[PDB]
Design an enzyme around this catalytic site. Structure first.
Site, PDB file in Angstrom:
ATOM      1  N   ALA A  93      31.193   1.687 -48.674  1.00  0.00           N
ATOM      2  CA  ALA A  93      30.528   1.132 -50.028  1.00  0.00           C
ATOM      3  C   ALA A  93      29.244   1.665 -49.877  1.00  0.00           C
ATOM      4  CB  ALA A  93      30.537  -0.169 -50.257  1.00  0.00           C
ATOM      5  N   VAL A  94      28.683   2.734 -50.977  1.00  0.00           N
ATOM      6  CA  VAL A  94      27.363   3.173 -50.439  1.00  0.00           C
ATOM      7  C   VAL A  94      26.521   3.104 -51.788  1.00  0.00           C
ATOM      8  CG1 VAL A  94      26.457   5.449 -50.692  1.00  0.00           C
ATOM      9  CG2 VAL A  94      27.123   4.645 -48.661  1.00  0.00           C
ATOM     10  N   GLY A  95      25.243   2.584 -51.659  1.00  0.00           N
ATOM     11  CA  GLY A  95      24.213   2.550 -53.009  1.00  0.00           C
ATOM     12  C   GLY A  95      24.844   1.319 -54.099  1.00  0.00           C
TER      13      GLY A  95
ATOM     14  N   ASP B 157      39.138   3.165 -50.556  1.00  0.00           N
ATOM     15  CA  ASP B 157      38.090   3.509 -51.610  1.00  0.00           C
ATOM     16  C   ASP B 157      37.698   1.920 -51.988  1.00  0.00           C
ATOM     17  OD1 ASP B 157      38.123   6.106 -51.535  1.00  0.00           O
ATOM     18  OD2 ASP B 157      38.863   6.371 -53.639  1.00  0.00           O
ATOM     19  N   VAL B 158      36.267   1.648 -52.225  1.00  0.00           N
ATOM     20  CA  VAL B 158      36.183   0.519 -52.456  1.00  0.00           C
ATOM     21  C   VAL B 158      36.145  -0.088 -53.803  1.00  0.00           C
ATOM     22  CG1 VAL B 158      33.375   0.984 -52.723  1.00  0.00           C
ATOM     23  CG2 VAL B 158      33.955  -1.338 -52.155  1.00  0.00           C
TER      24      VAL B 158
ATOM     25  N   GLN C   8      49.110   8.899 -56.119  1.00  0.00           N
ATOM     26  CA  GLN C   8      48.047   8.878 -57.099  1.00  0.00           C
ATOM     27  C   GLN C   8      48.815   8.552 -58.323  1.00  0.00           C
ATOM     28  OE1 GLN C   8      44.392  10.483 -58.391  1.00  0.00           O
ATOM     29  NE2 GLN C   8      45.637   9.184 -60.145  1.00  0.00           N
ATOM     30  N   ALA C   9      48.057   7.457 -59.070  1.00  0.00           N
ATOM     31  CA  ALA C   9      48.964   6.789 -60.409  1.00  0.00           C
ATOM     32  C   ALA C   9      49.333   8.134 -61.543  1.00  0.00           C
ATOM     33  CB  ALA C   9      48.210   5.610 -60.886  1.00  0.00           C
TER      34      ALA C   9
ATOM     35  N   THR D 295      46.921  18.570 -58.714  1.00  0.00           N
ATOM     36  CA  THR D 295      45.513  19.059 -58.726  1.00  0.00           C
ATOM     37  C   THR D 295      45.174  19.519 -57.425  1.00  0.00           C
ATOM     38  OG1 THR D 295      45.135  16.772 -59.582  1.00  0.00           O
ATOM     39  CG2 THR D 295      43.863  18.535 -60.606  1.00  0.00           C
TER      40      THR D 295
ATOM     41  N   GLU E 163      40.067  13.994 -50.920  1.00  0.00           N
ATOM     42  CA  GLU E 163      41.578  13.641 -51.456  1.00  0.00           C
ATOM     43  C   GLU E 163      42.270  15.159 -51.412  1.00  0.00           C
ATOM     44  OE1 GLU E 163      43.010  12.967 -55.812  1.00  0.00           O
ATOM     45  OE2 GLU E 163      42.637  11.220 -54.622  1.00  0.00           O
TER      46      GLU E 163
END
Length: 277
Positions: free
Chosen positions: A54-56, A144-145, A166-167, A178, A236
């Site tokens: 987790a950043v910023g 991923d946070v 991925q949903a 993708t 990803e």
């Protein structure tokens, strides 16, 4: 020890993919016996690690809710170590953990040019696997946070290398996916080729698998930087390349990572985790 019949029954969910052409369980709600595995795994005294960067702004937007949800739903009834990687340990929300959870926090440097990526999580994770995580746990999830646990996310998810559908793209066709299509990217997946679209928001496996997942992903990012090129969906995309060369031994259903703004299709019977605000 464990065999698939013992914990997994595809025919309790026949609509959806539950096994893969290479024999990996795709784990759906209703298809798994947690009780059995909880028991099976508790005897081996396994320990499950969860890394989360987790950043910023992400720290105060997301971390608290992440760790809290995890504390409540992640591998309940098994030792779990949260490895919190933050740029600023001062604003670590520092919640109250329950039985069988503990954490380790690490100060990471922010994105160093100019502007990095910033995943780079891949290098750090692998660094941490070598330094301590391989010694600390039998299974490691990297997440991923900016997500929330909504329900039990348990030992049914454990495996040598665990990938998340991925949903959006779970129903999709391999060539709708993708993937990075540009032959110049290490993340390159031909049209034609392609098993699933794996979400980078959750991968896992043994520290050794995850070490490799991450080391390969990073090598991809690195070679791409060398070719002044940047994969479509960054980490990803490399994950997706990686998981194509190296098929995940277990895959989790979009139920273990749901975008609630994709709705709620019948196919999503209990939401284990979901993306946030």
């Amino acid at each position: 020890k464990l065999k698939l019949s013992d914990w997994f029954n595809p025919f309790k969910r026949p609509e959806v993919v539950t096994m893969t052409k290479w024999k990996a369980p795709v784990v759906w709600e209703g298809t798994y016996n947690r009780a059995v595995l909880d028991n099976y795994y508790a005897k081996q005294k396994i320990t499950v690690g969860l890394t989360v960067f987790a950043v910023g702004r992400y720290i105060e937007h997301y971390l608290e809710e992440f760790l809290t949800s995890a504390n409540k739903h992640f591998m309940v009834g098994h030792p779990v170590i949260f490895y919190i990687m933050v740029d600023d340990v001062s604003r670590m929300p520092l919640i109250e953990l329950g039985p069988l959870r503990s954490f380790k926090v690490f100060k990471i440097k922010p994105e160093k040019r100019w502007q990095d990526i910033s995943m780079m999580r891949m290098k750090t994770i692998g660094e941490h696997i070598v330094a301590h995580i391989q010694h600390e746990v039998d299974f490691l999830f990297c997440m991923d946070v900016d997500q929330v646990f909504q329900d039990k996310f348990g030992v049914e998810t454990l495996g040598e290398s665990v990938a998340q559908l991925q949903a959006w793209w779970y129903k999709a066709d391999p060539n709708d996916f993708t993937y990075e299509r540009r032959k110049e990217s290490a993340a390159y997946i031909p049209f034609g080729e392609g098993d699933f679209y794996y979400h980078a928001a959750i991968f896992g496996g043994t520290p050794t698998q995850v070490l490799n997942i991450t080391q390969e992903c990073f090598k991809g990012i690195l070679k791409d930087k060398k070719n002044d090129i940047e994969a479509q969906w960054h980490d990803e995309s490399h994950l997706n390349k990686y998981f194509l060369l190296n098929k995940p031994t277990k895959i989790l259903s979009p139920e273990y990572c749901w975008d609630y703004h994709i709705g709620l299709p019948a196919d999503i019977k209990l939401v284990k985790m979901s993306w946030q605000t």
